[PDB]
Tab-separated table of N, CA and C (backbone and C1' of nucleotides) and ligand atoms in Angstrom:
chain	number	residue	atom	x	y	z
A	27	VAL	N	1.385	1.381	-10.071
A	27	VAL	CA	1.019	2.139	-8.862
A	27	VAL	C	1.831	1.638	-7.675
A	28	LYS	N	1.929	2.477	-6.644
A	28	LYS	CA	2.954	2.309	-5.620
A	28	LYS	C	2.313	2.034	-4.263
A	29	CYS	N	2.956	1.156	-3.501
A	29	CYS	CA	2.687	1.031	-2.066
A	29	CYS	C	3.009	2.350	-1.363
A	30	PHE	N	2.237	2.607	-0.292
A	30	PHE	CA	2.377	3.878	0.409
A	30	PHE	C	2.632	3.666	1.895
A	31	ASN	N	2.456	2.425	2.343
A	31	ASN	CA	3.001	1.973	3.618
A	31	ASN	C	4.521	2.122	3.626
A	32	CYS	N	5.131	1.712	2.506
A	32	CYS	CA	6.577	1.770	2.393
A	32	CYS	C	7.019	2.797	1.365
A	33	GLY	N	6.435	2.699	0.170
A	33	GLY	CA	6.786	3.600	-0.918
A	33	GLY	C	7.372	2.832	-2.094
A	34	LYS	N	7.309	1.504	-1.994
A	34	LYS	CA	7.798	0.645	-3.065
A	34	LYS	C	6.680	0.344	-4.057
A	35	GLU	N	7.066	-0.241	-5.187
A	35	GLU	CA	6.148	-0.436	-6.298
A	35	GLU	C	5.445	-1.787	-6.177
A	36	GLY	N	4.147	-1.786	-6.472
A	36	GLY	CA	3.426	-3.026	-6.731
A	36	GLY	C	2.321	-3.227	-5.696
A	37	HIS	N	2.733	-3.411	-4.442
A	37	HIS	CA	1.875	-4.051	-3.446
A	37	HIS	C	1.230	-3.003	-2.546
A	38	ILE	N	0.308	-3.467	-1.708
A	38	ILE	CA	-0.552	-2.574	-0.938
A	38	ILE	C	0.139	-2.194	0.370
A	39	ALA	N	-0.275	-1.054	0.892
A	39	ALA	CA	-0.158	-0.722	2.309
A	39	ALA	C	-0.648	-1.828	3.222
A	40	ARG	N	-1.878	-2.288	2.976
A	40	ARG	CA	-2.563	-3.147	3.939
A	40	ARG	C	-1.789	-4.439	4.159
A	41	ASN	N	-0.989	-4.791	3.152
A	41	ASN	CA	-0.325	-6.093	3.131
A	41	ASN	C	1.183	-5.921	3.201
A	42	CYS	N	1.583	-4.694	3.513
A	42	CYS	CA	3.013	-4.364	3.613
A	42	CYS	C	3.634	-5.125	4.760
A	43	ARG	N	4.632	-4.533	5.404
A	43	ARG	CA	5.409	-5.209	6.428
A	43	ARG	C	6.520	-4.294	6.942
A	44	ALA	N	7.109	-3.542	6.017
A	44	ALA	CA	8.052	-2.493	6.379
A	44	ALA	C	9.260	-3.088	7.099
B	30	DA	P	-0.360	-0.991	9.804
B	30	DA	O5'	-0.888	0.519	9.657
B	30	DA	C5'	-1.836	1.028	10.605
B	30	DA	C4'	-2.826	1.952	9.940
B	30	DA	C3'	-3.417	1.466	8.612
B	30	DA	O3'	-4.571	0.662	8.880
B	30	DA	C1'	-2.698	3.683	8.381
B	31	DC	P	-5.320	0.387	7.474
B	31	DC	O5'	-5.438	1.794	6.702
B	31	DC	C5'	-6.516	2.684	7.015
B	31	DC	C4'	-6.955	3.426	5.771
B	31	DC	C3'	-7.064	2.578	4.499
B	31	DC	O3'	-8.384	2.022	4.425
B	31	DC	C1'	-5.814	4.497	4.044
B	32	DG	P	-8.537	1.309	2.979
B	32	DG	O5'	-8.013	2.353	1.872
B	32	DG	C5'	-8.882	3.417	1.451
B	32	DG	C4'	-8.617	3.738	-0.004
B	32	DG	C3'	-8.397	2.513	-0.905
B	32	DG	O3'	-9.663	2.070	-1.405
B	32	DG	C1'	-6.674	4.052	-1.251
B	33	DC	P	-9.385	0.927	-2.516
B	33	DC	O5'	-8.248	1.487	-3.507
B	33	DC	C5'	-8.617	2.412	-4.539
B	33	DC	C4'	-7.734	2.198	-5.752
B	33	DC	C3'	-7.441	0.729	-6.098
B	33	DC	O3'	-8.456	0.250	-6.985
B	33	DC	C1'	-5.432	1.920	-6.014
B	34	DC	P	-8.043	-1.229	-7.483
B	34	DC	O5'	-6.514	-1.177	-7.989
B	34	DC	C5'	-6.230	-0.674	-9.298
B	34	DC	C4'	-4.991	-1.338	-9.859
B	34	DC	C3'	-4.859	-2.845	-9.621
B	34	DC	O3'	-5.456	-3.552	-10.713
B	34	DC	C1'	-2.881	-1.773	-8.971
C	127	ZN	ZN1	4.877	-1.749	1.092
DNA sequence: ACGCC
């Protein structure tokens, strides 16, 4: 499943960084 | 930013 803050694989929106 | 993993 994919991060949606960035759109990369693995990690969460909430913990993203962009 | 939110949700899930
Ligand atoms: Zn991300």
